[PDB]
């Protein structure tokens, strides 16, 4: 069987959001993986402030 080809070790396919398995909108790299949609929901939990 061939379910899996296409190494997927890099690029847009390997990037997966930690919150809702999203890959389309870009995902940051600060030790963190979000959507930028659900990051606004969770910044108040993970401890970012605006100032």
């Amino acid at each position: 069987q061939l379910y899996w080809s296409h190494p997927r070790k890099f690029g847009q396919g390997s990037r997966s959001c930690r919150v809702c398995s999203n890959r389309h909108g870009l995902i940051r790299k600060y030790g963190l993986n979000m959507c930028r949609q659900c990051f606004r929901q969770y910044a108040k939990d993970i401890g970012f402030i605006k100032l």
Partner: protein, 220 residues
Amino acid sequence: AVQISKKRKFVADGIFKAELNEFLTRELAEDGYSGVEVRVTPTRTEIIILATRTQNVLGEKGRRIRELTAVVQKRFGFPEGSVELYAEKVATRGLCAIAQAESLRYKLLGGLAVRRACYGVLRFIMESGAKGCEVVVSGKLRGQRAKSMKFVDGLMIHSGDPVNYYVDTAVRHVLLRQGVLGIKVKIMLPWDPTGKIGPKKPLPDHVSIVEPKDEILPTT
């Protein structure tokens, strides 16, 4: 053989706090779940769950807290009982807005019209020491068009800095056969100078003075 940077370890800790808190609010929605305080010790990691019905948390034999104690271990890899969970009884039930919206949800599921339920939770919150409160319910209520409803009692602050430590935001969803209902509860905590009840910094507008000093002052 493992260490990461101070720049990334803080945001990893924050993602851990958010993951833990929203898993506990996604499966502890039955009783009154308020929140957590996560304490770290190089021998043991404590998780305090501020909740309303600790009877439902202990359960039959002390079962559910030990089940979720195994749960928290089996994904974050802190074995051997290094992570210890405790639950705490929230004394002021009506003061936690997350608790009050969560109490409003299970009423609004089983019948219990929006007017009666909202006035019932507002009178309870205003009786429970609150200086001011606001409950907003949006959704398909008695029609096809999205008629939003607002309910304001007392004294509310919207702008400026001390919103972020005076106003406790509670935003929840309710699934019904009509669709979804979004609820927003925000409660201005009273200023109590000492204790766990409200915040300890006064309002910068509300300025207190002392009453007059004395009287007698004549020469000898």
